[PDB]
RNA sequence: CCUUCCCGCUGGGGAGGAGGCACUCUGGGGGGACCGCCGGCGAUAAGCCGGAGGAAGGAGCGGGCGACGGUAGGUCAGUAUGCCCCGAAACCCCCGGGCUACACGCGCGCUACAAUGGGCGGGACAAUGGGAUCCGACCCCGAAAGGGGAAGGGAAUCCCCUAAACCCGCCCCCAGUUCGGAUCGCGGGCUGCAACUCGCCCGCGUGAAGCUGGAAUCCCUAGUACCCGCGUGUCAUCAUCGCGCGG
């Protein structure tokens, strides 16, 4: 950054990025509470070490999961905003340093706004962006019915983070707004639970489709 | 002149740290950690220091020579080397356990290496394949 | 004051009010490199905007364009070095440029060379293949 | 935002389900509301371990299967 | 204080500004023209790029010692857009760095070992370390964890 | 006293070891100071042919490899030692080279 | 330990010699991991799972070796070989052309359609491999491509070889643009006996479609995929390719 103290920021306290603490952070959804890691972890970066196991994601910090979802490249095999995005070389895939700075600028943004811990804001956003029921087709005696099902909290997290990031991506695509700004907007919008957020909207639609399916 | 040598490895990156009594100066290839330009690399290297605390760092001086692959690998190898240096300088197992529960790979190494590339579109990867 | 949303440089090729070097690339025969050269030799700021250009500055870069090498431009940075009728190394602008292209082309045609033939048939002539990827 | 959802703790995994194997039938026990101990069998999507907590928009559906 | 103690880019700009006060650091007549390499696409957009470049070279010779023009060429090179074709690395031109080194040998900052390239002189390392200690102070108003060094 | 480098190279670690043991036991038969069999990086000549003549079918490759193990031994140059290390058998699949540092 | 050079806040930094293998590294020999321990599931078995500890945890990871046999699969255009044919021409050599033609259809890919960026200037960090008419530091000349001389190097000694993605600052601020670089003109070079047909490179100039892509379809389970560049094989000169390397 252009302040030289943000450029050579030195950590001292083991806050997250040496800037934001998590002791004051609380998650009121009990199904997500175990699966949301909020340890005093200075650097979110893990080096893949969790994926080889089945719930290392549970053991993994949450802002790390965010930046990893932000290392995105848009949507290649699906259509967010009705559009394939397909950034190929000008993406952030495998660029976690860029992703880290994107997330950090987003947090700084919202905290300039929102007068709140941005991690608190983020947990609120995934909470009210995370669905509870989905639908899937099951066979009973050989005949398929699009039944409704409940969603496991890990999968709820996965969806929430994914579609937060995807909304940010669609809003930053081919327009004047930055990825960080789109991300900030998406998180606070979802936390306020307004439909402007792609993520809240998507949660509501899969949920109303489920409550239609049963 | 009590000095202690430690070493760290992270995928084609080798750091050699020497630790001794001093003031708190810690240098990576003649350069202060304070000014290492990617924040992430700085933070990888600093984690053991923050975690161990100023109380002992301020009496320690460290110098790391790292001669390998990438900035991140170098940072991790340095992190390893200085973590081991602190532990072997202090003989504090409460600190060893603090590190081992924060990140075990801080003291044990990451054993991972790159998988050899295999024929079909070998330049891309061992499993990356041509299109049908 | 001294503002102009539009400016004529080298006739009435008329240029916006962005920074001057790119405004000049708005001319045929001028890229950003030749532009930066011309301005550096004429003492003008390239980052400057065109609205604040004075008529004498206009005249100055116009005369440079008229005879670049005489002003400090090298001979290896020009549209038309070692011309086919005067060994002078010169830089050509819009109309003289299309005319020069036309002339060398139809010279080749007059002598019925491969390039002239391939020009008049509108096909590639710089070694390409044309089988799979030249389809119009 | 958290509407009238009812927590439910997972006590036992049973066979997996779904045309493509993504669903897992499971036995769960409600924790709050009026049941406060009524086990029930639900079809849950995604990874689950025992001790997990799934929250339900209702409790009177009770899919059953072998 | 020293070069290794402070960062690079800030030092290069500061010592360029200071090198403008040296008379043997005139740009050559072909500077306002030419690119820095075939790997580039456009002329330098700055007017003092010559001083920035010789400052950089001076620091590089401080750090890497008996080094010459081909090594510096590969450091000042980089990636080229080769059109529709993929990207590759290309070295830079040698004339810029040669003229720079020669200007510096004139000013007294580098000398020329008969073999194995060029080497900074005491007056040269003094110049650089002076600028570095100055800079270190000005950013020790900031980081006292760097006052330490 | 001036020293003698013996660079020896083979495809068989055991022939190589045989020679080095010859040298060790002969130097200690005498009393001249050996410098160990320093093992140098072994050369892996790799040749990756396609194993098909036809050009048809899936492309499959044979990665053939030849390995050259290399040792060097420094021993002080005496006429006795030199005469007898010349007398050494030096089996067929090995090369040696006695340079002298003086 | 010796010698020397800078900051200076008189604290600290580097450099070269002996010093020695400490660290790294190299390469020979050994050890180590066996579901071995705890708990659970299955049957108490075979074994699976979770956990501990451990460098490594579930054939550790990744390769090589591809059974009997089939596929009149491909290859007699690599060699070997039957038959038929040519046999003084269907054998051998030379020149020139062609295989590089282009209204079109298809496969695999490169570059893009921009800000999850472009340019400029600065700052960083690799590994694999290769080198005799061969690598070529280093110096000089040149705007570049390139040119002259040339140390050392038959290979842990020298060189190829200070990679790019990344970061910092400054311009651009959502548009066929400072995106994109098809095409074409002029000139300057390298290889070669020969560069028109038909090579590669550089500089100025030009400034094509393309603003995310239907139906449908491909690859991939961890240091993997994606992204980034490098090496080598082919090679007189030619790499959007193959085989590999690391980030
Ligand atoms: Mg085993
Ligand atoms: Mg057959
Ligand atoms: Mg057949
Ligand atoms: Mg462009
Ligand atoms: Mg657009
Ligand atoms: Mg090929």
UniProtKB/TrEMBL annotation, chain B:
Q: Which Gene3D superfamilies match?
A: 3.30.230.10
Q: Which stretches are transmembrane?
A: none
Q: Which GO terms describe its cellular component?
A: cytosolic small ribosomal subunit
Region (Disordered), start-end ranges:
108-132
| Composition-biased stretches (Basic residues) | 119-132
- InterPro entries noted in UniProt: Ribosomal_Su5_D2-typ_SF (IPR020568), Ribosomal_uS9 (IPR000754), Ribosomal_uS9_archaeal (IPR019958), Ribosomal_uS9_CS (IPR020574), Ribsml_uS5_D2-typ_fold_subgr (IPR014721)
GO BP: any one term: maturation of SSU-rRNA from tricistronic rRNA transcript (SSU-rRNA, 5.8S rRNA, LSU-rRNA)
One MF term in the entry's GO annotations:
RNA binding
Q: Which UniProt keywords apply?
A: Ribonucleoprotein, Ribosomal protein
Compositional bias of kind Basic and acidic residues: 108-118
Family named by the database record: Belongs to the universal ribosomal protein uS9 family.
Q: Name the HAMAP family for this protein.
A: Ribosomal_uS9_A (MF_00532_A)
**Name of the protein this chain belongs to:** Small ribosomal subunit protein uS9
Give the species this sequence originates from. Answer: Thermococcus celer Vu 13 = JCM 8558
UniProtKB/TrEMBL annotation, chain C:
Q: Which PROSITE patterns match?
A: RIBOSOMAL_S13_1, RIBOSOMAL_S13_2
Q: Which InterPro entries match?
A: Rbsml_uS13_C, Ribosomal_uS13, Ribosomal_uS13-like_H2TH, Ribosomal_uS13_archaeal, Ribosomal_uS13_CS
Q: Which UniProt keywords apply?
A: Ribonucleoprotein, Ribosomal protein, RNA-binding, rRNA-binding
Q: Which Gene3D superfamilies match?
A: 1.10.8.50, 30s ribosomal protein s13, domain 2
Gene Ontology MF terms in the entry: rRNA binding; structural constituent of ribosome
Against Pfam families, the record matches this protein to: Ribosomal_S13
Q: What does this protein do?
A: Located at the top of the head of the 30S subunit, it contacts several helices of the 16S rRNA. In the 70S ribosome it contacts the 23S rRNA (bridge B1a) and protein L5 of the 50S subunit (bridge B1b), connecting the 2 subunits; these bridges are implicated in subunit movement.
This chain's protein is named Small ribosomal subunit protein uS13
Point out the gene that encodes the protein.
Answer: rps13
From TrEMBL, chain E:
Reading the lineage from the top rank, the first entry is: Archaea
State if Lipoprotein is listed as a keyword.
no
Pfam families from the entry?
Ribosomal_S19e
Tell me the Gene Ontology biological-process terms attached to this UniProt entry: ribosomal small subunit assembly; translation
Record key words, sorted: Ribonucleoprotein, Ribosomal protein
**Its Gene Ontology molecular function terms?**
RNA binding; structural constituent of ribosome
InterPro entries, alphabetized: Ribosomal_eS19, Ribosomal_eS19_archaeal, Ribosomal_eS19_CS, WH-like_DNA-bd_sf, WH_DNA-bd_sf
* Cellular component GO terms held in the UniProt record: cytosolic small ribosomal subunit
Subunit info here reads: Part of the 30S ribosomal subunit.
Homology family: Belongs to the eukaryotic ribosomal protein eS19 family.
Q: Could you tell me what this protein does?
A: May be involved in maturation of the 30S ribosomal subunit.
Q: Which NCBIfam families match?
A: PRK09333.1
Protein name as it appears in the record: Small ribosomal subunit protein eS19
Underlying gene: rps19e
From TrEMBL, chain F:
According to the UniProt record, one GO cellular component term is: small ribosomal subunit
Residues annotated as domain Small ribosomal subunit protein uS10: 5-99
Q: Which UniProt keywords apply?
A: Ribonucleoprotein, Ribosomal protein
Q: Which is a GO BP term held by this UniProt record?
A: translation
Q: What Pfam families does the entry give?
A: Ribosomal_S10 (PF00338)
Q: What's the name of the protein? A: Small ribosomal subunit protein uS10
Q: Its family?
A: Belongs to the universal ribosomal protein uS10 family.
Q: Which organism is it from?
A: Thermococcus celer Vu 13 = JCM 8558
Matches recorded under InterPro entries: Ribosomal_uS10, Ribosomal_uS10_CS, Ribosomal_uS10_dom, Ribosomal_uS10_dom_sf, Ribosomal_uS10_euk/arc
Tree of life domain: Archaea
| Gene Ontology terms for molecular function | structural constituent of ribosome; tRNA binding
Q: Which residues are in coiled coils?
A: none
Briefly, what is this protein's role? Involved in the binding of tRNA to the ribosomes.
**Ribosomal protein listed as a keyword:** yes
- Could you give the subunit structure recorded for this chain? Part of the 30S ribosomal subunit.
